[PDB]
Design a protein around this motif. Structure first.
Motif, PDB file in Angstrom:
ATOM      1  N   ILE A   2      14.523 -18.404  33.039  1.00 10.91           N
ATOM      2  CA  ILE A   2      15.321 -18.475  31.866  1.00 10.91           C
ATOM      3  C   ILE A   2      16.447 -19.425  32.094  1.00 10.91           C
ATOM      4  O   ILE A   2      16.577 -20.411  31.361  1.00 10.91           O
ATOM      5  CB  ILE A   2      15.839 -17.088  31.491  1.00 10.91           C
ATOM      6  N   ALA A   6      14.795 -21.877  29.669  1.00 11.32           N
ATOM      7  CA  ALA A   6      15.016 -21.280  28.368  1.00 11.32           C
ATOM      8  C   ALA A   6      16.377 -21.723  27.906  1.00 11.32           C
ATOM      9  O   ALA A   6      16.571 -22.071  26.737  1.00 11.32           O
ATOM     10  CB  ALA A   6      14.930 -19.794  28.413  1.00 11.32           C
ATOM     11  N   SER A  10      17.327 -24.452  25.002  1.00 15.22           N
ATOM     12  CA  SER A  10      18.167 -24.009  23.911  1.00 15.22           C
ATOM     13  C   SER A  10      19.446 -24.795  23.877  1.00 15.22           C
ATOM     14  O   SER A  10      20.150 -24.834  22.864  1.00 15.22           O
ATOM     15  CB  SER A  10      18.480 -22.550  24.058  1.00 15.22           C
TER      16      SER A  10
END
Lengths: 41, 67
Positions: A2, A6, A10
């Protein structure tokens, strides 16, 4: 996983939006940008 | 775009921001008045003796940047 992607993915979206801040700049504050040119001369 | 919280994080995760946007990021965060009248009345009076002069202490050889 993440913290790598991720987040990095983002965090793309930051410029996806910041890329247009100039569109307001030219229409946000521009009355001044503009007034100054005359008032100066 | 604007909002101190968005910018705080944007400037940390994207990192910094690009130059064409200095006007918006700063003016928001710094509460600038865009007091162009006040500024222009500083810009035009005439010769200013304190700094004619700058290369003598800070010899950066650019006759447009020292200006």
């Amino acid at each position: 996983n993440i913290m790598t992607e991720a987040i990095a993915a983002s965090m793309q979206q930051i410029y996806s939006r910041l890329d247009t801040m100039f569109q307001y700049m030219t229409n946000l504050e521009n009355r001044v940008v503009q007034s100054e040119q005359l008032q100066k001369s | 775009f604007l909002d101190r919280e968005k910018l705080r994080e944007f400037l940390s995760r994207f990192g910094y921001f690009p130059e064409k946007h200095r006007v918006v990021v700063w003016n928001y965060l710094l509460k600038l008045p865009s007091n162009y009248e006040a500024f222009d009345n500083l810009a035009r009076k005439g010769l200013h003796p304190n700094y004619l002069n700058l290369k003598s202490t800070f010899p950066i050889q650019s006759d447009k940047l020292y200006y």
